[PDB]
Amino acid sequence: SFPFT
Amino acid sequence: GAPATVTEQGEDITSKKDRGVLKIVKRVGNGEETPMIGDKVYVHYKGKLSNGKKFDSSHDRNEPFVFSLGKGQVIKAWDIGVATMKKGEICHLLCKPEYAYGSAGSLPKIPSNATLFFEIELLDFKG
Secondary structure: OOOEO | OHHHHHHHHOEEOOOOOOOOEEEEEEEOOOOOOOOOOOOEEEEEEEEEEOOOOEEEEOHHHOOOEEEEOOOOOEOHHHHHHHHOOOOOOEEEEEEOHHHOOOOOOEOOOEOOOOOEEEEEEEEEEEO
């Protein structure tokens, strides 16, 4: 999920 | 408003010069050093979608977001943008989807093919 990827 | 202003008045900070990440420095930070690859960086942020919805904020969680710079742990726009910041700086970033979540989006809030606006404060960085 945001704020990851 | 601020998203429109960084869209029209921001500087392209991409290496490709493809206008995929535009930046305005809102508060000048301290000295001349920017973080290096692999540093632990501590940021506060607020993110808005192109429909005006606020989709995330670290301020509201009363803790900074922390990640290792340049390792693809965050969207490309953030790796590229935070790498340009000094400690204490606040900037605005306008991120095309190729530097964010692309055609996939990100449940729950971020649709496919979304251009994102962020306000980011670089609190600290350390090796």
